[PDB]
Design a protein around this ligand. Structure first.
Ligand code: HEC
Ligand code: HEC
Lengths: 83, 83
């Protein structure tokens, strides 16, 4: 399974899918660093995940995503936790 | 959480951290595409995982991995499942 592969060190040499390093959106660790000082980061990011947005990291927009309000908040919190 | 983000499609457009794209081995989805539906795929891949391999995807070899035969079979089956 995926967790076993992580534990065994496999992911030092392998990604799940191709295209690493060339994606259209920002790295989550950079999102986490940016908003570390921001008290309302969770709701700000949840809004962007659900409703989409542009201009914060580049000119290409993130389209609105198929997530509930609760999921958007959960994803925001997880991203903020990334170190 | 991490699994939720993967399941929702977020990772098509985002990496977890900066510096992606330099892994030395093939992406698992590409391994899965190659060997999908071959009658000996599980045994073949389990053997490469455990014993290592060279020259199938490039010049850089995979060393033997610290896995049991059962774990190698588990890992092979998981990799073959990656869409
Ligand atoms: C942790 C136990 C794993 C698992 C499950 C896999 N790998 Fe590797 N791998 C690496 C390289 C350079 C290759 C290509 C070798 C070649 O050109 O022949 C591979 C290949 C694979 C495969 C496909 C094998 C095939 O013949 O098609 C598979 C299923 C696979 N790996 C699984 C490099 C590395 C590492 C670099 C030091 C390490 C660590 C791992 N791999 C670990 C694992
Ligand atoms: C799956 C539900 C997700 C989640 C959890 C996130 N994204 Fe994206 N995203 C994309 C692009 C181009 C941007 C930059 C937009 C801009 O310049 O403003 C983003 C941005 C984000 C953020 C940061 C938002 C901010 O204002 O700081 C976050 C937290 C985030 N995303 C999470 C592109 C895409 C996609 C391309 C089609 C898709 C799919 C996703 N993102 C999916 C998700």
């Amino acid at each position: 399974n995926e967790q076993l592969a992580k534990q065994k060190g496999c992911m030092a040499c392998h990604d799940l899918k191709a295209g690493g390093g060339k994606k259209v959106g920002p790295a989550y660790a950079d999102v986490a660093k940016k908003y570390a000082g921001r008290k309302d980061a969770v709701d700000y990011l949840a809004g962007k995940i659900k409703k989409g947005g542009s201009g914060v990291w580049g000119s290409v927009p993130m389209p609105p995503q198929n997530v509930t309000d609760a999921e958007a908040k959960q994803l925001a919190q997880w991203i903020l936790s990334i170190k």
